[PDB]
Amino acid sequence: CXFXLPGGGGVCXLXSECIX
């Protein structure tokens, strides 16, 4: 974190469908 536009295994929600 901070999340939002990350890079690893998961995405911030999904990339807009959650936060984004």
Swiss-Prot record:
Cross-link (S-(2-aminovinyl)-3-methyl-D-cysteine (Thr-Cys)): X15-X20
Description of post-translational modifications: Maturation of lantibiotics involves the enzymatic conversion of Thr, and Ser into dehydrated AA and the formation of thioether bonds with cysteine. The carboxy-terminal beta-methyllanthionine undergoes decarboxylation. This is followed by membrane translocation and cleavage of the modified precursor.
Alphabetical UniProt keywords: Antibiotic, Antimicrobial, Bacteriocin, D-amino acid, Lantibiotic, Thioether bond
GO biological process, one term: killing of cells of another organism
Residue numbers bearing the 2,3-didehydroalanine (Ser) modification: S16
Cross-link (Beta-methyllanthionine (Thr-Cys)): X4-C12, X13-C18
Entry keyword Lyase: no
Gene Ontology molecular functions: signaling receptor binding
Cross-link Beta-methyllanthionine (Cys-Thr) mapped to chain: C1-X2
Domain of life: Bacteria
Known role: Kills a number of Gram-positive bacteria. Acts at the level of cell wall biosynthesis by interfering with bacterial peptidoglycan biosynthesis. Specifically inhibits the conversion of the lipid II intermediate into polymeric nascent glycan strands by transglycosylation. May interact with the peptidoglycan precursor rather than with the enzyme.
Similarity remark: Belongs to the type B lantibiotic family.
Protein's recorded name: Lantibiotic mersacidin
Portion held of the full protein: 49 to 68 of 68
